Design a protein around this nucleic acid. Structure first.
Ligand code: MN
Ligand code: MN
Lengths: 131, 131
DNA sequence: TCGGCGACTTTTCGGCGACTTTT
DNA sequence: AAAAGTCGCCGAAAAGTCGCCGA
């Protein structure tokens, strides 16, 4: 009895993805919203500069499918270590604001807040359609 | 069978806790109330002026959980030796005023009275809701 | 007596190949 | 045949109680 759902978020690392990863993700025909790059997140480790550059993708599947469905589809796309920690997204509004660290979880924990503009929306991601 | 309860008090020693302990207690997401620093308690031994610096944390679990649980929950958070003497609290109010030694028993036994201003409330600890 | 800790138990949840349904 | 999708099944950690205490 795995959970089937429409909204997912996962991480992409610049190392494990090919050059054209952006055009690579457009192919699937599914609305995505790709956070700006996270080169400046404070690590929960002493003396430690920042966490590694990563992305937060917000993935809007067209029908209820399972976490594993999405992991594998992007594992085919970009390399089997391309992504990590695919999760089911419960509140879309938050996990969109979370790409900027400008949700309330993030500013409450005072994390470094990125630029609205660098978010990349693939196949006409409509924030309003899902809220 | 051990006792289940929602209200707890335990002690925090500044030596055994990391710099960012205060913020790390906020992570647990639980209403806490942290005594002002207890650096001038009268020691019960002759020629011993003060007791070792401590804090009294006042801890409100979201569901009746066991003394031991809270102990694990905090060892893992601040270090195996971070805390001490976790007990269940039967009257919050009295034990709230005890953080300043302004309860009945504290003023009764002539304990050193600290300043409210230094009390720290974590996650919107609202003493009034508890009476 | 009653706070304590290691041993244990129990959820919790994200992986990943293997099997299965869909195209 | 191939794509996509889910199904067992594993592991680890974050949680929790239990056993015995021990001063
Ligand atoms: Mn991040
Ligand atoms: Mn004290």
């Amino acid at each position: 009895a795995k959970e089937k759902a429409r909204y997912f978020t996962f991480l992409l690392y610049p190392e494990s993805i090919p050059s054209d990863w952006e055009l690579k993700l457009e192919t699937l025909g599914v609305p995505m919203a790709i956070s700006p790059l996270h080169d400046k997140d404070k690590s929960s480790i002493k003396g430690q500069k920042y966490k590694k550059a990563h992305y937060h993708v917000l993935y809007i599947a067209k029908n209820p499918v399972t976490a594993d469905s999405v992991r594998k589809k992007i594992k085919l796309l970009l390399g089997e270590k391309s992504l990590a920690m695919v999760q089911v997204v419960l509140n879309v509004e938050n996990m969109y604001l979370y790409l900027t660290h400008e949700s309330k979880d993030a500013i409450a924990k005072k994390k470094h807040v990125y630029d609205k503009a660098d978010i990349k929306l693939i196949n006409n991601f409509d924030i309003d359609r899902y809220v």
